[PDB]
């Protein structure tokens, strides 16, 4: 699973 939106890296 992911952990957030790409703009949160």
């Amino acid at each position, epitope marked *: *699973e*992911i*952990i*957030g*939106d*790409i*703009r*949160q*890296a």
Partner: antibody
Amino acid sequence: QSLEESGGDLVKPGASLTLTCTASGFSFTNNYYMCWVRQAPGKGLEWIACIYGGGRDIVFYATWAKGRFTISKTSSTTVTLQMTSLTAADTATYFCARENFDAVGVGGGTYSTDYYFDLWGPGTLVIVSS
Amino acid sequence: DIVMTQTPASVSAAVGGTVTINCQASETISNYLAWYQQKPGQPPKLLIYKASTLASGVSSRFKGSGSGTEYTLTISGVQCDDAATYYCQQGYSISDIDNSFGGGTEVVVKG
């Protein structure tokens, strides 16, 4: 694989309302976001909120939405949108939509991007009027 | 906040001709751009995603192109069944944005 919104209704200004999207022929998994997109009569599409089909709690709101609307998973086949402090500007058809994403990686964790909607309900009508 | 601007707001095309719709993004979106067609009383139908990938079961008369900040939708062999409203939709981010859809373009088919 389909969707059916419900809960739409005629309500007074200031009222709250909860809409429900019910999935069939599939169930929410870490592959999708489940989303609400609305559209006021004669106007454009307006994105509202997404919630992660996966197990982790991840929610995104449009900036006009956060604080007034709440998206949630109430089961693996149902997502709700709670609306509060409704005004006539909230009169719209409300669509439930499944959202695709690619999980790109960055240094240490994966992130979602490349969002598009591949599945929509026919909508439920919310009408706010005195 | 990534603001999708579509132009023109409306456009005409004679039957058999070609129509182009434009989408502009306030910032680069890495070709994460989707195009939908909506007919009255219906939910939108996905046409194109990843800027240029034609969705399954959609007419190849629909072409998505462009990159960076400027995208395009080109309908070739325009037909009456095409009269609809078209939307572009940036798929780069759902964090910190107002709307992912552009304002949409009305396509009128001159028969």
